[PDB]
Design a protein around this nucleic acid. Structure first.
Lengths: 97, 55, 203, 199
RNA sequence: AGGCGAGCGCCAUGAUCAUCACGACACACUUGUUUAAGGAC
RNA sequence: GGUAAUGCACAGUGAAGAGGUGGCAGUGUGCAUCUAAGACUAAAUACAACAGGAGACCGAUAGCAAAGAAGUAGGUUGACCG
RNA sequence: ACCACACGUCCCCGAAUACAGCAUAGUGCUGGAGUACUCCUUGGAAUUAAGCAUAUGAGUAAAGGAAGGAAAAGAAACUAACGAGGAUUCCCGUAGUAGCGGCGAGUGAACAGGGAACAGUCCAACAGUGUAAUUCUCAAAUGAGAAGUUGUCAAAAGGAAGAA
């Protein structure tokens, strides 16, 4: 059997290359900026025209009573992900302020 | 192995070979599928999977 | 532009305006016959993502499907076999409910090709869909440069062979280790490649 | 053959009309029963807006201004192109939802008309809120056909104007003041009242 | 924000969200009472 | 094969514009790699009827059921059988 | 005379239709046959476990739908942790392995490494506003009308080779 002869320490070694730095892409052109602005604008109009959904109302009500941990549990069960819940709570909080 | 055949079973004073289901022809009641039968299947039919070449 | 505003509103399915419109439309769809022709698309943005234009030789049809799982077709629950295969209820179909809509529209509109389909509503009993159809024997279409491909003879009955957006999803196709069951083209193509004995000349 | 009365049509069950011969009647049963349902239930504030529109008198006043900026016909267009370029840039009234929304967004548009009887409505639903945010005046008209007649062609969803000839300026300003009264000035109050069932 | 027994639990009533019967209308749904009858059952 | 879910469905519930994955459940945090929910695509691969060429194959109880007017003579109420 | 190549003629029943469903400005299209090979559904039991109920045979048989000379697939919400590679399909191989399993009987893949053949592109998001510039019909040598603003319209002839 030609397997499992080296230790983990010696398997971790590596050859000394010379690396190339990554080309950063930070510049964003004028036309790309206007494009992003118009999309964010459109998102405002929808919220203005049609308002909040039932679970969003129930959520925001709990935030007024400082029921932070109840709101957390509630949102987790509605959206599934604990990450989506943490994000949606932060967006709702900012809307109320 | 083409034909419709079945054994008559014991009690008829005949050997229990499969026989051809038919009527109106002399072929009725003849002995069908086995290697010891006229028009039956050969023992261990020759087959393409045999090893033809040699190393 | 205009199509962006429509997208954002179509996504808010529990806004007051969308609850209003879903209620009134689902009432009307159920008063009509089970497959009927529409005047135009209900949602302009969605139809245009999927390839609709308002030119001669394209149409929208609308279809309804009954909801829930599909029971085993046996009398009195008698299955004549082993107990692990005796269940009748709680058996779920392999294809989406959408796939049934596409298959039935294609039978009725036999002179035309099924392009794509989308959701338009639900209630307690039915689910409702719009199907985009094209006519390959039409001079306008034969000379188009974007949908002229649908006239190729291989494009007959895409829906029956699991090739449309609604019918494709039950096949299990994809890229990576999570889809090893379909390496080769399909489940049956993988089966053949795995259950074959290879007998070389020199061996 | 015979025209059925309103009472009859409201009585019939559409699902029991089944023969090929009966399809036109099935259509009429559905049409009348839908009307009764929509009058019975409350409208959200945004949909309720399109219940308020100009009088036939105001429509006349507006049309009698706008008609002087009619678009070119194909006959006119051909002639123009055989001749050379001459004179100043024309003023023309503009049409179609795609162009209008662009001109609102670019803050080019100066006054806008919108039609009410549009199906599906989601095409025009957002226009008043966008007009209020950009600060452009507007007015609502009953039918798509009312608009078609202004520009002497097929019905449309909306019309727009981006410029004013000095000749017209006095009348123009008065019209805008009338419109602001019925429409733009009232907006913030309107977005909070639900449409009552109709008596 | 009131009252009782050597701030405690117990007894008063005043604001905040669901919510179970009962009424009275008509719009879903039901029925050849059909230019009609029921009715959120 | 997919093991505290590999893929596909049905009912409830239901996102974000930024998200998905790194074969063992969870929470946090850097790092690497990609961009779903719209479409098209040649060549290299598979195999009947019908035609052509070959063979250490069979030689009229064999070889296809059938080397002649063979799916024929003939038979089943019938499906079918020969 | 006779033969070989093509054409003309081609009774009645049969999808069998003076019909059904459906599209266009209009002309029209579908239906039945075939289905070895390819794609999509539905779905057994004999048998093995020396009994048998989970499991096996097997996602196989049977029954339905559909297409072509092939069909399906296909240009990474992909692998990998190397000093990394780079669409799909096929062959050699990893491998009767990692694992699944009354952990019994039995089942069972992937990347690498060596090759055959090689090719990349479209729609939406996003079309001239000093004028729908776009498609169709009839006339005419320059007019009438239909579709369309709930959005139309984003360019080349051309050739000698190769094979039967």
């Amino acid at each position: 059997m030609k397997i499992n002869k080296l230790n983990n320490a010696s398997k971790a070694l590596s050859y000394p290359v010379k690396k190339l730095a990554k080309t950063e892409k930070a510049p964003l052109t004028e036309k790309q900026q206007r494009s992003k602005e118009l999309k964010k604008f459109a998102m405002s109009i929808a919220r203005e025209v049609g308002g909040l959904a039932p679970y969003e109302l129930r959520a925001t009500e709990l935030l007024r009573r400082d029921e932070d941990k109840r709101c957390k549990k509630f949102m987790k069960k509605r959206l599934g992900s604990l990450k989506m819940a943490k994000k949606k709570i932060e967006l709702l909080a900012e809307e109320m302020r | 192995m083409r034909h419709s055949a079945k054994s008559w079973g014991t009690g008829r004073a005949m050997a229990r070979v499969p026989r051809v289901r038919a009527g109106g022809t002399r072929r009725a009641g003849q002995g069908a599928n086995a290697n010891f039968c006229r028009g039956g299947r050969m023992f261990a039919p020759t087959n393409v999977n045999r090893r033809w070449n040699r190393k | 532009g205009y199509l962006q505003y429509l997208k954002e509103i179509r996504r808010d399915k529990q806004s007051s305006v969308m609850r209003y419109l879903l209620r009134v439309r689902c009432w009307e769809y159920r008063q009509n016959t089970a497959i009927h022709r529409a005047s135009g698309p209900t949602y302009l943005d969605k139809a245009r993502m999927l390839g609709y234009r308002n030119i001669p030789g394209m149409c929208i049809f609308r279809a309804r499907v009954r909801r829930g799982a599909r029971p085993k077709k046996v009398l009195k629950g008698n299955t004549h076999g082993k107990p692990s295969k005796s269940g009748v209820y709680q058996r779920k179909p392999a294809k989406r409910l959408q796939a049934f809509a596409e298959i039935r529209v294609g039978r009725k509109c036999s002179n035309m090709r099924v392009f794509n389909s989308y959701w338009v509503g639900q209630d307690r009993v039915y689910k409702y869909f719009e199907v985009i159809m094209v006519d390959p024997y039409c001079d306008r279409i034969k000379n188009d440069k974007k949908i002229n491909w649908l006239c190729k003879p291989v494009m007959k009955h895409r829906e029956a062979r699991g090739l449309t957006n609604g019918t494709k999803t039950s096949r299990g196709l994809g890229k990576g280790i999570r889809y090893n069951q379909t390496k080769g083209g399909s489940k049956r193509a993988a089966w053949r490649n795995r259950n074959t004995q290879s007998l070389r000349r020199y061996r | 053959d015979i025209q059925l009365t309103k009472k009859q049509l409201l009585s019939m069950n559409p699902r029991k009309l089944t023969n090929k011969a009966q399809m036109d009647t099935r259509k009429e049963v559905i049409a009348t029963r839908k009307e009764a349902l929509v009058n019975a239930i409350k409208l959200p504030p945004a949909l309720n807006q399109f219940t308020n529109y100009l009088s036939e008198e105001d429509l006349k006043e507006v049309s009698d201004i706008l008609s002087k900026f009619r678009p070119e016909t194909r006959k006119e267009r051909k002639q123009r192109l055989q001749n050379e370029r001459k004179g100043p840039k024309p003023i023309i009234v503009k049409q179609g939802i795609k162009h209008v929304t662009k001109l609102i967004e670019e803050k080019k548009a100066k006054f806008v008309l919108i039609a009410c009887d549009v199906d599906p409505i989601e095409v025009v639903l957002y226009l008043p809120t966008l007009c209020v945010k950009m600060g452009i005046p507007y007015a609502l008209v009953k039918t798509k056909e009312d608009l078609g007649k202004i520009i002497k062609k097929k019905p449309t969803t909306c019309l727009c104007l981006c410029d004013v000839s000095s000749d017209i300026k006095s009348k123009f300003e008065n019209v805008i003041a009338k419109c602001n009264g019925q429409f733009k000035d009232n907006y913030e109050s309107a977005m909070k009242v639900w449409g009552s069932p109709k008596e």
